[PDB]
Design an enzyme around this catalytic site. Structure first.
Site, PDB file in Angstrom:
ATOM      1  N   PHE A 162      -7.684  -6.858   3.193  1.00 37.25           N
ATOM      2  CA  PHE A 162      -7.820  -5.519   3.334  1.00 37.25           C
ATOM      3  C   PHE A 162      -7.829  -4.919   2.138  1.00 37.25           C
ATOM      4  O   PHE A 162      -8.646  -3.815   2.246  1.00 37.25           O
ATOM      5  CB  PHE A 162      -6.260  -5.416   3.636  1.00 37.25           C
ATOM      6  N   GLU A 216       0.760  -1.332   0.002  1.00 40.20           N
ATOM      7  CA  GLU A 216      -0.110  -0.060  -0.024  1.00 40.20           C
ATOM      8  C   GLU A 216       0.803   1.229  -0.067  1.00 40.20           C
ATOM      9  O   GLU A 216       0.316   2.392  -0.435  1.00 40.20           O
ATOM     10  CB  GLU A 216      -0.933  -0.015   1.376  1.00 40.20           C
ATOM     11  N   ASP A 219      -6.919   6.318  -4.674  1.00 42.51           N
ATOM     12  CA  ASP A 219      -6.256   4.791  -5.191  1.00 42.51           C
ATOM     13  C   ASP A 219      -6.005   4.536  -6.569  1.00 42.51           C
ATOM     14  O   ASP A 219      -6.212   5.444  -7.522  1.00 42.51           O
ATOM     15  CB  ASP A 219      -6.831   3.696  -4.323  1.00 42.51           C
ATOM     16  N   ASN A 238      -5.827 -20.133 -10.961  1.00 38.02           N
ATOM     17  CA  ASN A 238      -7.209 -19.745 -10.962  1.00 38.02           C
ATOM     18  C   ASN A 238      -7.532 -18.238 -10.673  1.00 38.02           C
ATOM     19  O   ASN A 238      -8.144 -17.301 -11.055  1.00 38.02           O
ATOM     20  CB  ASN A 238      -7.934 -20.476  -9.935  1.00 38.02           C
ATOM     21  N   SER A 292     -11.332 -20.365  -6.128  1.00 43.20           N
ATOM     22  CA  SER A 292      -9.892 -20.388  -5.582  1.00 43.20           C
ATOM     23  C   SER A 292      -9.808 -20.694  -4.145  1.00 43.20           C
ATOM     24  O   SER A 292      -9.039 -21.350  -3.734  1.00 43.20           O
ATOM     25  CB  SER A 292      -9.487 -19.106  -5.854  1.00 43.20           C
TER      26      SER A 292
END
Ligand SMILES: [Cl-]
Ligand SMILES: [Cl-]
Length: 162
Positions: free
Chosen positions: A104, A11, A20, A132, A117
């Protein structure tokens, strides 16, 4: 390496509101403020989150605090979710970090949607789960971060972050 260090690499840290990868207003260590387009609605959310008039900038201290809360919330969301908990329970310490990372970034609802998955992680079929996860919008949108998370699941080591 640990979940905090892992997420801090993924991040980064911004002490000024930013946008973002998808356009949302964020601040700190990946803390989403609002999905709205309004810088102002974002400045408001920021003040509510910090408890002070912030004029869009926070201290490192305020950023870490938000980060601590968000990791804690990530974990508790996983343990509360019927789909995620059993996946989490089944994994080793490293791969658990990998699933917290995904929660998160995309939230519990989103991760919860990787049904196929999740099923393969649960079965410990690493190479197939990795294959996958790679056909997902997630992978296509943030490929480098996704490759890091994916390799952590495939291998069970922190290699990708070293
Ligand atoms: Cl918050
Ligand atoms: Cl990326």
């Amino acid at each position: 390496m640990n979940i905090f260090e892992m997420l801090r690499i993924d991040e980064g840290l911004r002490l000024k509101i930013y946008k973002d990868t998808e356009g949302y207003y964020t601040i700190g260590i990946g803390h989403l403020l609002t999905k709205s387009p309004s810088l102002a609605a974002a400045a408001a959310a920021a003040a509510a989150a910090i408890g002070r008039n912030t004029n869009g900038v926070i201290t490192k201290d305020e950023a870490e605090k938000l980060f601590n809360q968000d990791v804690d919330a990530a974990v508790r969301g996983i343990l509360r979710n019927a789909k995620l908990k059993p996946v989490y329970d089944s994994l080793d310490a490293v791969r658990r970090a990998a699933l917290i990372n995904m929660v998160f970034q995309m939230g519990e609802t989103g991760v919860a949607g990787f049904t196929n998955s999740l099923r393969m992680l649960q079965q410990k079929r690493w190479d197939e789960a990795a294959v996958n996860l790679a056909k997902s919008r997630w992978y296509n949108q943030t490929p480098n971060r996704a490759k890091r998370v994916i390799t952590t699941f495939r291998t069970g080591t922190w290699d990708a972050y070293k």
